[PDB]
Ligand binder design. Sequence first.
Ligand SMILES: c1ccc2[nH]c([C@H]3CCNC3)nc2c1
Length: 330
Amino acid sequence: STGSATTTPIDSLDDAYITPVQIGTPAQTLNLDFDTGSSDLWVFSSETTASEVDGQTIYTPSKSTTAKLLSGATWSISYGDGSSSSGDVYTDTVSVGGLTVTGQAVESAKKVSSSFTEDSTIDGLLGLAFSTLNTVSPTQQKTFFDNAKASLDSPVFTADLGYHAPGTYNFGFIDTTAYTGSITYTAVSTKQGFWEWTSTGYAVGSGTFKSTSIDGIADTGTTLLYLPATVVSAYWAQVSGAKSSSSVGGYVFPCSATLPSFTFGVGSARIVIPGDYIDFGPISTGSSSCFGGIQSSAGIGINIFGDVALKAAFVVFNGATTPTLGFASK
Ligand SMILES: c1ccc2[nH]c([C@H]3CCNC3)nc2c1
């Protein structure tokens, strides 16, 4: 089997991407944030605290003839950005772009933090990291990909995120028309439950390539590119007037600037992030200070190849017995 679904930016800055997902019988379609950096499929629901729901579409398990309470199961998750959610668990039929999994753990939110409430466009998350990170207790549950894998034509999914445009998540096949040149594959460590890999280096604009190992994760659920402070300083030093602002919480730059590209290495291959991808607009409405799309990972504990990096590539998440990651230009 295969599946193919369109993923759409939630706003003009590509702050996140949403993908329609069918849950239950008859189908309830929710728009979920596909997140290769976490492993829980959770949704706004009929069980979510009423004051914490603001415009989201909710899952109502009582209206699904295939929903079953997973007795005694609870979940609770906190993401690196301060956000969190928690609740109980159903199993139900879940379909993405024509690919169907029966008995998928659908984690129903009883509580969500303010940042989730404030995103009216995101109805929940669909985790695509390794199932060892799943937070359901006392019986850990499998991701949608993990459940689908044996049935897929090939045990893979691909992320093709657009810049200011829709893109595609495919399951079970590689669309050879969706990228240019070849796909370069690189080793993955699953030791921390992430799609963790080692970039071979970077360049700023037309500058020389610096060969240096940068361990990080491929994370579709993180907006920006978070890299070591040395690398990030080298980037913003090429932008006149750019500086790190403790009050704003990262590097900012004059909105009148023209941003240089940023290149990262995948083996001997190179992925080029155009300068425009690194612009996240005025820090507040009407401001001439703009927020940068490359930021320091110093306070995080891990480097994160988020959407800013990933949307410059066609990315293969290869879930073979020994997982690997593939990157192609597009
Ligand atoms: C900013 C700070 C911390 C962050 N942690 C994350 C990801 C890492 C894996 N799941 C959450 N994005 C972040 C953005």
